[PDB]
Amino acid sequence: RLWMGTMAMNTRWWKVLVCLYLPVLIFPIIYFVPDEQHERQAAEREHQKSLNQ
Amino acid sequence: AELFLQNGLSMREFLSLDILCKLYAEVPGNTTIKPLLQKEMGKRQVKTIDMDVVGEVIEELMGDMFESYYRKDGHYFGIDPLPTPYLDVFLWAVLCNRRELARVLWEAGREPMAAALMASRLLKRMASRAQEDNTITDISSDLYDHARLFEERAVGVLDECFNENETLSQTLLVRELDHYSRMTALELAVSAESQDFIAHTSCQVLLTRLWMGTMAMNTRWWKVLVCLYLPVLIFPIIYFVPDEQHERQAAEREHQKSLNQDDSMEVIMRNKKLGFCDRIMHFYSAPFSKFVGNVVGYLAFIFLYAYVVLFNFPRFDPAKTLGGIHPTEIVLYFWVFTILIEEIRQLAAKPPKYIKDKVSVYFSDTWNFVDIFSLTVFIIAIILRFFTNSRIFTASRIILSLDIIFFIVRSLQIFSVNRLLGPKLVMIQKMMQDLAQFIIILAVFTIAYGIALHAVMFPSPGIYARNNTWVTITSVVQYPYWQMYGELFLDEIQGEKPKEFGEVDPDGRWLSPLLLAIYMVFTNILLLNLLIAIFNYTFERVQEDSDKVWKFQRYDLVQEYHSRPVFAPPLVLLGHILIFIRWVWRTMKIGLSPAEMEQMDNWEFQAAE
Amino acid sequence: FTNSRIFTASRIILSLDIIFFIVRSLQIFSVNRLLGPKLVMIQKMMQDLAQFIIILAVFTIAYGIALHAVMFPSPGIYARNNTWVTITSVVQYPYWQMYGELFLDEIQGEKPKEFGEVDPDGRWLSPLLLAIYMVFTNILLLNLLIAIFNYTFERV
Numbered sequence: 001r002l003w004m005g006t007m008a009m010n011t012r013w014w015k016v017l018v019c020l021y022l023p024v025l026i027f028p029i030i031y032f033v034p035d036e037q038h039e040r041q042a043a044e045r046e047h048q049k050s051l052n053q
Numbered sequence: 054a055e056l057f058l059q060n061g062l063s064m065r066e067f068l069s070l071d072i073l074c075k076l077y078a079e080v081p082g083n084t085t086i087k088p089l090l091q092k093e094m095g096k097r098q099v100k101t102i103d104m105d106v107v108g109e110v111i112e113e114l115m116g117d118m119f120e121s122y123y124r125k126d127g128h129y130f131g132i133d134p135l136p137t138p139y140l141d142v143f144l145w146a147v148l149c150n151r152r153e154l155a156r157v158l159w160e161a162g163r164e165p166m167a168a169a170l171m172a173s174r175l176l177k178r179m180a181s182r183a184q185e186d187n188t189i190t191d192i193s194s195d196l197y198d199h200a201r202l203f204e205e206r207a208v209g210v211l212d213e214c215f216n217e218n219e220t221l222s223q224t225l226l227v228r229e230l231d232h233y234s235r236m237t238a239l240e241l242a243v244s245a246e247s248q249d250f251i252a253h254t255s256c257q258v259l260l261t262r263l264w265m266g267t268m269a270m271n272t273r274w275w276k277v278l279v280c281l282y283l284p285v286l287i288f289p290i291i292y293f294v295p296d297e298q299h300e301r302q303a304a305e306r307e308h309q310k311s312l313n314q315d316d317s318m319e320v321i322m323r324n325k326k327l328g329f330c331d332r333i334m335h336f337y338s339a340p341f342s343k344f345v346g347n348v349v350g351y352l353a354f355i356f357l358y359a360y361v362v363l364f365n366f367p368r369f370d371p372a373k374t375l376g377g378i379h380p381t382e383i384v385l386y387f388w389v390f391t392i393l394i395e396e397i398r399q400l401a402a403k404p405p406k407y408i409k410d411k412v413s414v415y416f417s418d419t420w421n422f423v424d425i426f427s428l429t430v431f432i433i434a435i436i437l438r439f440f441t442n443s444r445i446f447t448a449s450r451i452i453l454s455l456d457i458i459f460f461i462v463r464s465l466q467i468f469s470v471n472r473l474l475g476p477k478l479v480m481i482q483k484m485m486q487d488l489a490q491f492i493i494i495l496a497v498f499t500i501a502y503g504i505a506l507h508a509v510m511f512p513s514p515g516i517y518a519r520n521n522t523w524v525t526i527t528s529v530v531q532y533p534y535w536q537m538y539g540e541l542f543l544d545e546i547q548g549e550k551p552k553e554f555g556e557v558d559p560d561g562r563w564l565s566p567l568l569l570a571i572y573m574v575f576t577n578i579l580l581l582n583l584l585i586a587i588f589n590y591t592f593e594r595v596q597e598d599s600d601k602v603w604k605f606q607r608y609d610l611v612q613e614y615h616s617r618p619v620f621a622p623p624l625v626l627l628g629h630i631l632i633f634i635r636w637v638w639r640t641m642k643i644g645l646s647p648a649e650m651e652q653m654d655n656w657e658f659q660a661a662e
Numbered sequence: 663f664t665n666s667r668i669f670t671a672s673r674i675i676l677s678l679d680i681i682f683f684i685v686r687s688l689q690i691f692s693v694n695r696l697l698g699p700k701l702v703m704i705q706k707m708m709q710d711l712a713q714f715i716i717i718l719a720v721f722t723i724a725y726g727i728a729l730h731a732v733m734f735p736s737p738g739i740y741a742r743n744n745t746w747v748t749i750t751s752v753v754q755y756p757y758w759q760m761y762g763e764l765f766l767d768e769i770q771g772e773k774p775k776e777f778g779e780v781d782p783d784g785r786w787l788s789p790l791l792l793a794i795y796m797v798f799t800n801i802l803l804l805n806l807l808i809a810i811f812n813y814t815f816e817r818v
């Protein structure tokens with residue numbers, strides 16, 4: 001996790017290699033820790049809902 | 054729940070449809086099934102849970118065209134009781150990941166072995182679903198461990214069934230189960246990758262019996278080889294399953310005296326008899342006879358392809374008749390076209406019914422890469438052949454003369470039917486990883502030494518500078534590599550051989566052997582001996598597992614040759630047409646009677662107890 | 663019978679029978695406490711050697727046919743016009759190349775008189791195919807055979 005410092009856990013080497021020299025691609029294709037944590041929290045709020053109605 | 058069942062609760066009366074819908078309505082929230090049910094009923098806009106939703110989730114958790122009975126049976130839509138109360142409450146228990154409740158409901162059930170195999174499939178498939186998805190919480194190791202428990206239970210019931218009666222247990226493995234979408238227990242044990250179940254003696258003996266499809270157990274290869282081409286010898290010397298079973302029954306009737314004064318599975322597992330014309334077609338329909346045929350045809354192909362490549366592959370000239378082409382090469386086109394058709398029908402006959410899914414499962418095993426590569430490479434060569442130009446003709450003959458490697462290396466699959474060679478060929482592919490790691494480290498030392506050696510021998514500008522880029526780049530890689538295998542270029546790297554090797558710099562003449570000496574210590578008597586140590590370490594660990602992997606792959610082998618065309622290697626392409634006629638007109642299991650199905654359920658249940 | 667051909671057959675047959683009469687000595691060596699068990703261990707290792715040679719033969723023949731086809735084209739200027747030497751060369755040269763007898767001068771352009779003149783495109787294909795063959799033969803299979811013998815030696 002410290003090796004993946006403020007960056008999504010499944011970001012591959014080539015994606016980093018492309019984004020290192022093309023910093024315009026840095027925003028669209030690189031996911032971050034807030035994004036995945038927001039997704040998990042947004043999902044887990046929905047799982048607590050009742051299955052009917 | 055266990056205590057209520059075994060005191061005075063009867064699940065036939067208890068479980069109605071509303072109770073079952075109420076059970077699925079009140080799933081916890083922390084489980085894996087809850088997101089899946091929500092996602093399924095999320096699409097198609099349905100506010101209330103029903104069994105159609107649950108059926109579709111169970112269908113997508115078993116991908117090989119599974120058909121849950123909730124989607125079709127009339128009892129699960131919206132009084133007489135439900136058909137299988139114990140089963141669908143057990144399915145609810147395993148989908149909620151409740152260990153003790155699933156065990157309790159498993160022990161009070163009709164088919165323990167099939168239910169256990171379906172459970173393990175469901176658990177490990179939803180485990181992988183939970184692992185690879187971000188909007189589902191990772192409880193994957195718990196689900197894999199629970200799947201492993203049900204795998205052990207399935208093997209245990211099989212083992213007890215085998216110890217009681219060895220024949221009817223093999224009949225138990227090929228039962229066409231009605232509650233599991235017409236799918237047999239062996240197919241369920243293959244769907245969930247259960248190597249311990251398939252490696253069990255009962256399954257292995259069954260696979261050997263299916264391999265000997267409607268043919269005596271001790272019919273040797275040469276007897277089949279003779280009878281394959283001489284079909285008049287098919288009746289006298291080939292024994293069959295009815296003959297040996299008639300002999301055993303006729304003997305066992307005498308032992309009781311006082312001492313004083315497409316129907317292959319049926320004829321395997323019944324008391325059916327074969328006439329004259331039946332036991333010809335049944336001989337040709339056997340997987341082992343198709344295998345022997347395949348081997349003979351394959352040998353013919355390799356000798357034919359080796360001849361054309363070594364001796365007679367001329368260039369195309371329009372002046373001569375037929376382009377000066379020997380008939381041999383046309384016979385080669387014919388056989389490669391036959392192999393192409395075989396690979397097309399191997400693609401077409403996969404379990405999923407989606408061309409992407411067929412292709413995805415078709416490229417699962419690594420042989421099909423080699424198959425499609427070698428076939429593509431061949432077609433490209435024959436396309437390039439006809440143009441009458443020295444450069445691209447040289448490209449054509451080189452491409453064929455290298456494709457021989459892949460067609461010959463493809464023989465190792467027909468060698469892997471053997472008990473001894475099979476496991477060894479699995480062990481080799483498991484050692485390829487350690488070889489790959491070794492070559493990476495070796496490449497680093499090789500290139501370091503190579504650049505240093507070439508720089509010192511041949512200075513960069515000057516009198517001794519070789520004025521050519523490609524030979525420099527290739528020499529750096531070349532000479533260090535051959536020096537590993539004892540090809541020491543001691544005359545060359547020192548002063549001698551000015552004409553052949555090239556004249557060396559005066560100070561390179563004494564640096565080169567010194568650098569060689571150091572390189573030979575760190576390469577030959579360190580790394581190579583370390584590679585020997587790595588292989589001996591991993592051989593024992595791989596020895597344990599590679600046998601099970603070979604045991605498991607015997608099913609695919611038998612199932613492959615069960616579906617192959619009936620006719621022999623010379624006419625095999627003619628045989629292929631009959632499958633096309635059957636397909637344009639528009640299997641390893643038996644259907645039992647209701648009385649027999651009841652008897653088999655009772656015997657299986659007692660074995661589970 | 664006094665005839666050069668069958669006399670040559672006679673002396674060759676005797677000069678090869680010496681092998682079997684000398685190898686027969688290993689039974690009189692097997693009365694020893696130490697040499698006896700070792701001679702039993704050898705015959706139990708012959709099975710693993712047999713399996714190894716089968717797999718090795720498949721790689722040898724694949725490489726052999728490819729090598730000879732590329733060096734010497736099938737008809738043409740560089741086609742060697744002799745069937746027996748072709749059949750024996752396919753088997754021969756790959757086999758000696760296992761034991762470090764790399765024919766690097768021969769499979770490349772040099773030695774036109776001894777080995778035979780090679781096709782211009784075979785001159786650069788042959789070392790590349792050799793290099794691949796040497797990886798999969800010397801530093802994979804032979805080391806795997808060492809691993810197989812050490813595994814089975816304790817059990818035997």
Ligand SMILES: *[C@@H]1O[C@H](CO)[C@@H](O[C@@H]2O[C@H](CO)[C@@H](O)[C@H](O)[C@H]2NC(C)=O)[C@H](O)[C@H]1NC(C)=O
Pocket residue numbers: 514515516517518519520
């Ligand atoms: C490579 O090219 C270089 C430069 O043209 C050659 O070096 C010259 O060789 C001549 C003849 O021996 C000398 O008189 C010069 O003094 C050299 N030049 C320098 C700058 O020192 C060299 O001969 C060529 N080498 C080969 C092998 O062709």
Ligand SMILES: *[C@@H]1O[C@H](CO)[C@@H](O[C@@H]2O[C@H](CO)[C@@H](O)[C@H](O)[C@H]2NC(C)=O)[C@H](O)[C@H]1NC(C)=O
Pocket residue numbers: 737738739740741742743
């Ligand atoms: C093998 O035989 C072939 C065919 O007879 C010979 O190839 C011919 O060689 C001559 C002389 O070099 C050329 O003029 C012809 O063009 C070649 N024929 C063709 C069809 O290209 C070849 O010389 C013989 N090889 C050996 C080593 O004896």
Ligand SMILES: CC(C)CCC[C@@H](C)[C@H]1CC[C@H]2[C@@H]3CC=C4C[C@@H](O)CC[C@]4(C)[C@H]3CC[C@]12C
Pocket residue numbers: 562563566567570
């Ligand atoms: C095995 C142990 C003793 C290490 C041996 C290292 C030897 C082989 C190395 C180290 C120094 C090297 C020598 C260094 C100097 C010379 C002088 C001249 O003739 C060129 C080669 C020659 C003769 C080298 C031959 C190889 C060499 C002798």
Ligand SMILES: CC(C)CCC[C@@H](C)[C@H]1CC[C@H]2[C@@H]3CC=C4C[C@@H](O)CC[C@]4(C)[C@H]3CC[C@]12C
Pocket residue numbers: 496499527528530531534535785786789790793
């Ligand atoms: C050990 C690792 C680095 C792999 C090394 C592979 C080397 C030895 C292989 C791969 C490509 C091959 C080269 C391909 C092209 C040429 C050009 C010419 O000179 C003929 C041989 C030569 C020089 C080959 C020599 C052997 C070669 C260099």
Ligand SMILES: [Ca+2]
Pocket residue numbers: 396399420421424
């Ligand atoms: Ca295939």
